[PDB]
Amino acid sequence: GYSRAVRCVETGVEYPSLSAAAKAMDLFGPQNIYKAIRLGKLAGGYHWVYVD
């Protein structure tokens, strides 16, 4: 199986899944990080991308 890892662009922190990133950011769920990645929008004031 596969869980795509994500990087917070401005901080450099990398999380093993959308869900781990969402939890670290106090967000409702992985959908909120997915939205930031797909739309190039901010979450927590930062940009987000996949790294694998």
Domain span at residue 41 reads 6-50
30 located within any domain: yes
40 in any annotated domain? yes
d(CA 52, CA 26) in angstroms, rounded, equals 23
Alpha carbon 21 to its chain's center? 5
Spatial neighbors of 32 by CB under 8 A, at least 6 apart, are 22, 25, 43
In whole angstroms, what is the distance from residue 25 CA to residue 33 CA? 9
Cα separation, 2 vs 44, in Å, equals 25
Q: Is residue 19 part of a domain?
A: yes
Residue 44 lies in a domain: yes
**Resolution attained, angstroms:** 1.2
- Domain annotation covers residue 22: yes
In a domain, 38, yes or no: yes
Residue 46 in contact with residue 9, Cβ under 8 Å? yes
- DSSP per-residue letters across 21-37: HHHHTT-S-HHHHHHHH
User: What is the count of structural domains for the chain?
Assistant: 1
Q: Could you tell me what percentage of the chain is helix, strand and coil, using 3-state DSSP and rounding each to the nearest 5?
A: 35, 20, 50
Residue 1 lies inside a defined structural domain of this protein:
no
| Cβ-Cβ contacts under 8 Å for 48 (sequence gap 6 or more) | 6, 7, 8, 9, 21, 33, 36, 37
